[PDB]
Amino acid sequence: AFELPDLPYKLNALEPHISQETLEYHHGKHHRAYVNKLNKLIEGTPFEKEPLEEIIRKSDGGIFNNAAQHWNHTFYWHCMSPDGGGDPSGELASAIDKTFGSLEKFKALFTDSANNHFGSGWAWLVKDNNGKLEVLSTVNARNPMTEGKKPLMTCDVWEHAYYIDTRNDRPKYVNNFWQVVNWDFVMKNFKS
Amino acid sequence: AFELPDLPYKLNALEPHISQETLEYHHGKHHRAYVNKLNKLIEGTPFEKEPLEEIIRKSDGGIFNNAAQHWNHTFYWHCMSPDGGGDPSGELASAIDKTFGSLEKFKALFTDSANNHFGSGWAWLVKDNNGKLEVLSTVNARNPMTEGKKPLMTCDVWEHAYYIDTRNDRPKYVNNFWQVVNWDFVMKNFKS
Numbered sequence A, B: 001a002f003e004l005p006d007l008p009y010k011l012n013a014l015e016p017h018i019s020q021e022t023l024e025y026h027h028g029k030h031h032r033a034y035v036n037k038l039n040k041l042i043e044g045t046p047f048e049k050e051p052l053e054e055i056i057r058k059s060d061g062g063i064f065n066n067a068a069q070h071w072n073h074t075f076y077w078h079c080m081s082p083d084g085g086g087d088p089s090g091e092l093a094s095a096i097d098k099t100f101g102s103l104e105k106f107k108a109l110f111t112d113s114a115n116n117h118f119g120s121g122w123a124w125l126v127k128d129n130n131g132k133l134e135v136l137s138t139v140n141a142r143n144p145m146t147e148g149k150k151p152l153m154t155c156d157v158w159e160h161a162y163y164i165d166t167r168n169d170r171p172k173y174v175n176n177f178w179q180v181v182n183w184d185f186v187m188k189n190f191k192s
């Protein structure tokens, strides 16, 4: 029932910050696999016709892992852009200043979250039910929406996300992520 | 006070099954970093002068993660050899046949454990202190000795173990592992 979404940009659009080869493997093999495995697992189960978000909220095991990874990568592609980088603007910028003190403090907090996460996972900027901004990392496929928190931005820190381009140097990859970060998408997410 | 152990063979000794480049990054950077971070964390703490096994059994958080990974990687290098591959012999072979039915069923079981483990981790052949052989995988840095089980063989399934050589294709890497598996080490562990 689920499909691999097209990338929001060309395979070479994030160069030289994220390579074409990485996008070929990361989207064309890793994400594609999650979609295919998800579809097979949920066939003939209560999750067969459920929305993706509802599968994530109610499932466990392989169904959860593939469903959550599918959502997580779909979200991740929109968090980057050839037009990305620079600073946020408007109320997102204002809210970041209020919550974290400044943009550089927030960036440092997200960078540390991403760099210090042990093993596979995701670094997140989220909004809680009270509208308060928060930085946190999750293990493997886990997604903050299972704790009632809305994702605004994510950075994949599974080793496949960067090993082709930076090998073991995850911090260099996170710096590369900042050069392509799509603030327009983050702000769109912030404003609902 | 811990030290990066020397690799038991030359950097090209596992070619073409595991590349020189992989061993340069995996041992020379990944393993080296675990040893260094371990030493910094344990200094000034009750774990400073403890044996590595005791640090693993009594610590948590970053100390555990770095202590366990240091142990795991050291163990992992001896589980491979340029003279490796082929079949086990003697008591080990007999014990494998008794417990799992045959060598190929054991290989299938270990292969599936290694291939199916979601995220970063380790596939293991262990012996419980009843003496029974068991195949299982652990998440991230976790080591079966905390459950009183003695490791006999391990295969690192963190993406850095193979991404340079097989990219997303972990199954191909596990086949490459079987060509260099060091049964002499596994049997030594089995018998002691």
Ligand SMILES: [Fe+2]
Binding pocket: A026, A030, A073, A156, A158, A160, A161
């Ligand atoms: Fe990913």
Ligand SMILES: [Fe+2]
Binding pocket: B026, B030, B073, B156, B158, B160, B161
């Ligand atoms: Fe490793």
